[model samples]
Target: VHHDGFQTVKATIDWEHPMFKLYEKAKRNGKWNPADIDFSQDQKDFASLTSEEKISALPLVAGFSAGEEAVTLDILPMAHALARQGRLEDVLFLTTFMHDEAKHVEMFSRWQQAVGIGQMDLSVFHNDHYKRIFYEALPEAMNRLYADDSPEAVIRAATVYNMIVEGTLAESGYYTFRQIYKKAGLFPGLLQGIDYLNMDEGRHIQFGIYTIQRIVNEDERYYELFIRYMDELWPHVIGYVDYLTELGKRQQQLARTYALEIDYDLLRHYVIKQFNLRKKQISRT
Candidate 1:
């Protein structure tokens, strides 16, 4: 009668479903333990950073801390949605999705502790735009799934979590990480751990694209719904990107800003290209 996976799919399973495929990948690739990552080098490396570097880096680390923690907190509703629908494949993949976010929370926290900034007061870095997205949009959308796990609601959840938070903001963090690390040539452990983080997140993004596109494939109107949400999110998205960029640069003189506002319409492309490219990942199953 209600949500239950075992009864719905006791006889059949679509191993070819993208969810199952991704679930298989999660089982295999998700095995890496954050405990093994050698934060020893990063410990010294973090201590060595100039105040400027630390100031510049803190916002990102804190922002990531905020992002990762929120995902782990907020992702349960989405998982519940699929589980309710008896989508075993989606449910299984989300099990690792939850695990990935949880590890990310620990990984970042461990890095902070290893680096001697464990007690940092990072809430200041969560600007209005940041709060708008994560504090508000993220939780609202994901939680809405519990009351209404409709196709449209799922689309919005992926747009917020997958496209905006993970795809754009997290990718932006990676780009910032490269920029930060390129100059220092230190923190091999941090670098290597991020490599794994990106690998896990890349799979998560694929799930989002699949989930969004799956709905669109069945109903064209939902595609418009996604655009509507993205369009509505445009200002805050651009705002948060620039906010994160400038917040860091304010700490260090030259921490590069994404400059999403430079060309307005044109540079919107810069902040937006990844999600648009994500959209292109669509076509048939």
Candidate 2:
């Protein structure tokens, strides 16, 4: 009945009212026509793009998409932890996130197919390269980390899952997607869907930071435990982000043929700026 300490059962009911509607619409009509995008000059330029432009985008898209999968899995585990500890607030947050992320999984799949830049099979995509490591390691890390049976552990898990993984890591890759589409005129509609997904992710991040701050304020033991885990995890977080960025560079190399230069800095800046506005508008507990 509560999340972030507010009575939210009614709110949950209200939110779910239209939740499946968008998804059902997407399911019935999964195709988004790239040619329908309203970027005339961009389309002309896209027609001239080199091979590197197309290849570079695929891995970044896959990388960002893969990160959400990790976060979704983390949420289910974190929800179990919170429910076990009777933290209704945390439970509601994760439950909503899990559902939103499930929609996201569908969004990425549909968006890629629409753009004709499909996902790799599990075997090929799971190569232990830059993003592969994070995708592979996240589940194990969260499972062991959340076993502490305290709100601090939950905070540590959620902060890493939502804030670091979804917020920073996914945000960086999203910039790549925006850049490619803006420059090369492919999948603008898909970018809109990506933008929607990012909007939800930002909310998830804010929820995580708020939940952790609340737990830290209410209990020193929780604060101490969170601090300890963050001490070890923060550096790894930075490294993981940088690695994904590197993966973006590599994918950009491959996508140039399809006119998807995923590393265009101006486009990246634009995408991040919009999200910054979203962050500013978000209020805390």
Candidate 3:
């Protein structure tokens, strides 16, 4: 038994690991500071908007702001669980995950303050479906790690966190933001941040999908858990998208001028497509 604490220390990272390789690439490519964004134009553009227009923008922006913070706060336990597994690469990658989440929170907060809506009461925007996912479901799934580190728990967490919340819901939101803001020619700073965030979340979801594959491979039971949890949570997602669809209907500029029609069917189509693609990607492993 070669039990030497000194020699156990790794002097270098194994780039051969797919997740670690992703971590290295993400660290090198996705480095950006929220402070670098110049929000002067976003401020002026927002100030010029009519009261109705401001209300329209609030739901989208506030949803992301609150959602980002919720994820940031809740994701730490998964890292804790990963660390307990004694995988240096996973822990390292998770550090980047936490870092990126923090930056996301900062970027949205910065955007809010810059656009002069920082103090606005956006709590009214968080509807029941939104609360169900972010407030109740996501935290419950993730926090279960503290009590149970079983493969079932991991599948539940990833299903809610990666597959549904980030992959389906957040990706759709980012798509809408890019289309609407780019077409409106507004919020350059906010758009830049969203672009960066979209890239970051791609890495996050990739890692998550890979990790889930590994867990499922260990015990086929996790696959059933994945299907079960997704079945349960998907309705809540549809409800949330329903709210967004109505918001888009009321906010005519989002549909007419920006061409970002948040139609329930269209968004649901993309959600189903993306979710199945992720499921296939993991199943391939």
Name model 1 segments beyond 4 Å from true. 1-9, 253-270, 282-285
Model 2, span 1-285: residue lDDT tens: 354443354344333423233333433444433334444443344345465654545555666567666666666777677576655545555566677777777666655555444554432333344343365445765786556755656666655565556654577666666655656556565676677676666667666666676776676566555545544554554454455466666554445455554444554454445434433432332
Better structure of 1 and 2 per TM-score: 1
TM-score per candidate, chains pooled: 0.88, 0.63, 0.91
| Ten contiguous residues minimizing lDDT sum, candidate 2 | 13-22
Residue 278 lDDT in candidate 1: 55
The candidate scoring highest on lDDT is: 3
* Full candidate order by TM-score, most accurate first: 3, 1, 2
Alpha-carbon shift of residue 228 in model 2 (angstroms) = 5.9
Worst window of 10 by summed lDDT in candidate 1: 258-267
> Once all C-alphas are superposed, what RMSD does model 2 give against the true structure?
7.8
Candidate 2's displacement at residue 89, Å, is 4.0
Per residue, candidate 1 scores C-alpha lDDT tens digits across 32-143 of 7788999998888767767666676677787899999999999999998888887788988998999999988888888888998888788988888889998999999999
lDDT of 3 by residue, 1-285 (tens): 342343126456666778788889888977799999999999998897777777787888878988899889888889888767666688788888889999999999999989887788788988999999999999998999988988888888988998888887899888777666777888899999999999899989987798789988887777877777778887888788788778867777645644555455766587678767766766622
RMSD of 1: 4.0
Cα error of candidate 2 at position 165, Å: 0.2
Number of clashes found in candidate 3 = 0
